[PDB]
């Protein structure tokens, strides 16, 4: 199949600041990969993003029957949906499973990457810290960053560059809104 | 902000593929099975707290379809430019031999939203337990998609996620096998 494709996307974006104190509704019309016309509630009316969308902007703005529905949508649409889905979306909190292990199985006193795996958590915001004998190491930390699994869970790998000597105690500390006190997992060399 | 809820719809010609979904901070809340006219909650537990009339989405698609025709003509038939996907294969959690895990095939930054994915265990197609998400929206108006394969990790098997998209020259294979 080599036929040309033509794509039309319509997007209604509800942006929420400080709970629902501030809400911004954004309707977007996109042909192929180009946004052509949009309604921004901060603007109050349609605006052509490209020349292709001009006949729709000046046309839709001509009907105050349409503009009133959209302007009011910040309440009847955005705030309503926030209210309905708040308990299972906004307030969703799944605790991370934390494990610590060296990447390479090898004799001691050789360079190794100590990985602190943090998986299955929600929401995304999190902080992972490495400690060596009770002292925080800030250098030599390599992270995969935040990874979205697509099933309402995140995972991340925070690795510490080290040459583990015998007797050393390495501790990974995770802070996350799903727990009131930091999760700590230790690895003893 | 703190949060974003997105109602994202698309219609694509000549495929006649339509989609209707809600997105929350990058995750799918639900979509509508167009053929069967039912609401599909990404996590089934969601449908225990909220409802959506799937029938309403079909009129949206009808409007989307009509508007596409008009817009194709307006641009005098500028076809979409294919953007090939970045493919990544990873696992749900750290791999432990002989302990159930899940292979995630992440397909990102592509358009149009048509892709073909097949899992390969030692070069053979696997369908058992496979699941996939619908096409998820991006700010740059490209798409993302996830494919899943539950599997039992072992030193004996290798895996490939095979993705074919019009932007690619040949089918892409991202390789996974246990390493240690």
């Amino acid at each position: 199949d080599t036929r040309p494709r033509f794509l039309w996307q319509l997007k209604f974006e509800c942006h929420f600041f400080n709970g629902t104190e501030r809400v911004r509704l954004l309707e977007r019309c996109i042909y192929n990969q180009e946004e052509s016309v949009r309604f921004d509630s901060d603007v109050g009316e349609y605006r052509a993003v490209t020349e292709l969308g001009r006949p729709d902007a000046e046309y839709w703005n001509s009907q105050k029957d349409l503009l009133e529905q959209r302007r009011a949508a910040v309440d009847t649409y955005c705030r309503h949906n926030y209210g309905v889905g708040e308990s299972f979306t906004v307030q969703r909190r799944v605790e991370p499973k934390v494990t610590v292990y060296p990447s390479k199985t090898q004799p001691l006193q050789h360079h190794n990457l100590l990985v602190c795996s943090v998986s299955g958590f929600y929401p995304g915001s999190i902080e992972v810290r490495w400690f060596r004998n009770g002292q925080e190491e800030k250098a030599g930390v390599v992270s995969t960053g935040l990874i979205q699994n697509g099933d309402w869970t995140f995972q991340t790998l925070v690795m510490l560059e080290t040459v583990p000597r015998s007797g050393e105690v390495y501790t990974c500390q995770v802070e996350h809104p799903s727990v009131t006190s930091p999760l700590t997992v230790e690895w003893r060399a | 902000e703190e949060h974003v809820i997105i109602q994202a719809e698309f219609y694509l010609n000549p495929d006649q593929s339509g989609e209707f979904m809600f997105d929350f901070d990058g995750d799918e809340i639900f979509h509508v099975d167009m053929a069967k006219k039912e609401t599909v909650w990404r996590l089934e537990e969601f449908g225990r707290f909220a409802s959506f009339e799937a029938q309403g989405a079909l009129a949206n698609i009808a409007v989307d379809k009509a508007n596409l025709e008009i817009m194709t003509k307006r641009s005098n038939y500028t076809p979409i430019t294919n953007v090939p996907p970045e493919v990544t294969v990873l696992t749900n959690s750290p791999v432990e031999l002989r302990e159930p895990n899940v292979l995630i095939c992440f397909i990102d930054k592509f358009t149009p939203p048509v892709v073909n994915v097949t899992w390969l265990r030692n070069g053979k197609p696997v369908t058992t337990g496979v699941s996939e998400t619908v096409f998820l929206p991006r700010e740059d108006h490209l798409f993302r998609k996830f494919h899943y394969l539950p599997f039992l990790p072992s030193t004996e098997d290798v895996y490939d996620c095979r993705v074919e998209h019009w932007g690619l020259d040949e089918p892409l294979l991202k390789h996974w096998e246990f390493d240690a």
Binding site: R70 | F30, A50
Partner: peptide, 14 residues
């Protein structure tokens, strides 16, 4: 009323 509400797109010009 625990329904997820939705908006419908307007028809393009012509």
């Amino acid at each position: 009323g625990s329904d997820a509400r939705f908006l419908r797109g307007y028809h393009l010009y012509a």
